Amino acid sequence: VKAVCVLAGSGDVKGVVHFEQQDEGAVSVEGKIEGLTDGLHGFHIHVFGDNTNGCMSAGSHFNPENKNHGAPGDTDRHVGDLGNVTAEGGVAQFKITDSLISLKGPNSIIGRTAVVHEKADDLGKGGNDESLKTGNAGGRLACGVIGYSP
Amino acid sequence: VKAVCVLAGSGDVKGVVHFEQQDEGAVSVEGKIEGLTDGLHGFHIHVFGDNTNGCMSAGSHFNPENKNHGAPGDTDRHVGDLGNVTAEGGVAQFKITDSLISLKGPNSIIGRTAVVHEKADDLGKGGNDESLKTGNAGGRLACGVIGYSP
Ligand SMILES: [Cu+2]
Ligand SMILES: [Cu+2]
Ligand SMILES: [Zn+2]
Ligand SMILES: [Zn+2]
C-alpha cells in the first residue's frame, strides 16, 4: 500500500511526504519540506485528520498503545513519534523506516495528520511533564491529512 | 465514528463536509460549499487521497465492486456516487445519507478524496461511455482528503 500527504500551514512552510508498506512490515517514509529554519524540527503523526482549524484541530499525538512520548528507537514512545528532521539551506529531505506506524490495521495512520514542528523534539528527555507529552516541539508549522496514493 | 474534509481548489470554491456513522448504518453527510455557479454540481468520492497535483491526482471514482457510474439510488453505481448538490446564491448547503459508503471496513472512505464538480452529474443517463464513468460532470472545482474528526 502507498500513501501521501501534502503539508501546508499559515506561512510559507510546505512539503510532501510519501509512505509505503509491503505486507504488514515496516513503513518507508520519504519526504521534502521547504521553508524551515536551520536545525532540528519535530515530525509527528497527530491523531485527527481534521484541518478545519488549521493544524490545531489535529489534536495530540497518535497513541493507541498508551505510552509516553519518546524517540523512535525507544520502547516507551507514541506510535506517532517519528523524531526530528534536519533542515539545512531552508530544506529538510529525509528517509526513515518505522515499524510502529502502519498503513493498515489498528495502528493505521491513514486519515490522520502529519505535522512538522517549530522546534526540536526533546525525545522525552527534557525533564518536565510536557516533554512526556509532546517533546516540547512547540508550534505546528505545517500539516496535512494522510491519504491513499497510486 | 466521525470524519471531515476541507475542500479547496485552484479558484474561489471552498467548503467543509462532515461525515458521521453510527454502528454500521447509513452515513450522514452534511456540508457547505461556497463559490459555486447556480444549479446542480456533481459530488463524488474519488479513490485516492493524493492532492499532490491538486484535484487531478485524486483518481477516478471509488469503485471496489467494478460497476458502472449511476445515481445514488441505482444498484449499478460506484460506491463513490453521491449524485448532485444544488447551489443557490453561490452556496450549496446539504444534508444527505448514503448506504454504500462507510467510515470503517472495506468500503471506508477515510483517506480518499471528496470532489465537487463543475457540471451536473447526468447519473449515468447521458447516452455515452463517459456518462458511465463520470456522469459527464466535468472538471474538479474543489477537493479534500477525508480524515478522522473528534
Ligand atoms: Cu507533535
Ligand atoms: Cu467525480
Ligand atoms: Zn509523542
Ligand atoms: Zn461514479
Residue A76: which of A63, A95, A90, A60 has the closest Cα?
Answer: A63
The answer to whether A8 contacts chain B (CB < 8 Å) is no
Distances (CA, A) of B127 to A98, B132, B149: 50, 8, 40
* Residue of A5, A51, A104 to mutate for B, most B C-beta atoms under 10 A: A51
Domain residue spans of chain A: 1-150
| Contact predicate A86/A39, CB 8 Å | yes
The C-alpha cell 477537493 sits at B143
Residue-by-residue DSSP string for A87-135: EBTTEEEEEEEESS-BSSSTTB-TTSEEEEESS---TT-SSSTTHHHHT
Burial of A85 (0-12, 13-18, 19+ CB in 10 A): buried
CA-CA distance, A63 to A70, in Å (whole number)? 11
Q: Give yes or no for B20 touching A (CB within 8 A).
A: no
DSSP B65-120: T------TT-SSS-TTEEEEEEEBTTEEEEEEEESS-BSSSTTB-TTSEEEEESS-
Q: Which of A41, A77, A112, A117 is catalytic?
A: A117
Considering every ligand atom, which ligand is closest to the CA of B130? 4
Burial A61-77 (b: 16+ CB within 10 A, else e): bbbeeebebbbbebeeb
Q: Which helix (H) or strand (E) holds B133?
A: helix B131-134
Name every residue whose Cβ is closer than 8 Å to that of residue A22 and which is 6 or more positions away in sequence: none
- List residues, by chain if needed, whose CB lies under 5 Å from ion ligand 1: A 44
Grid cell in block for residue B62: 471509488
Tell whether B52 is within 8 A of chain A (Cβ): yes
Catalytic residue numbers of B read 44, 46, 61, 69, 78, 81, 117, 140
CATH topology of domain A1-150: Immunoglobulin-like (2.60.40)
List the determination method.
X-ray
Four-residue CA torsion sign, B102, A7, A50, B39: negative
Contact B105, B89 (CB under 8 A): no
CA atoms within 13 A on the CB side of A52: 19
- Asked whether the beta carbons of A37 and A45 are under 8 A apart, the reply is no
Q: Do B150 and A113 touch (CB under 8 A)?
A: no
Please check whether residue A145 touches B, CB under 8 A.
Answer: yes
C-beta contacts of B124-132 below 8 A and 24+ residues apart: B124/B68, B124/B69, B124/B70, B124/B71, B124/B74, B124/B76, B124/B77, B131/B69, B132/B68, B132/B69
Q: Which residues of A touch B145 (CB under 8 A)?
A: 49, 111, 144-147
Three-state DSSP class for residue B19: strand
Among candidate residues B16, B45, B14, the one with its CA nearest the CA of residue B113: B45
- Give the span between the Cα atoms of B49 and B59, in whole angstroms: 9
What are phi and psi for residue B94, nearest 5 degrees? -145, 160
What DSSP character marks residue A8? B
d(Cα A115, Cα A139) in Å, to the nearest integer? Answer: 10
Ligand showing the shortest atom-to-Cα distance for residue A63: 3
For the record, the C-alpha cell of A48 comes out as 485527527
CA neighbor of B142 nearest in space, from B116, B119, B109, B121? B116
Inter-chain CB pairs, A–B, below 8 Å: 84
Compute and round to an integer the Cα radius of gyration of chain B. 14
* 3-state SS assignment for residue B132: helix
Distance of alpha carbon A12 from alpha carbon A63, whole angstroms: 29
CA dist., res. B54 & res. A16, Å (int): 12
B109 contacts chain A (CB < 8 A): no
The answer on whether B44 is annotated among ligand-binding residues is yes
Is B29:B18 a contact under the CB 8 Å cutoff?
Answer: yes
- CB pair distance less than 8 Å for A113 and B147: yes
Exposed/middle/buried for residue B66 (C-beta within 10 Å: 0-12, 13-18, 19+): exposed
Q: Percent helix, strand, coil in chain A (nearest 5)?
A: 5, 45, 50
User: Collapsing DSSP states into helix, strand and coil, what is residue A56?
Assistant: helix
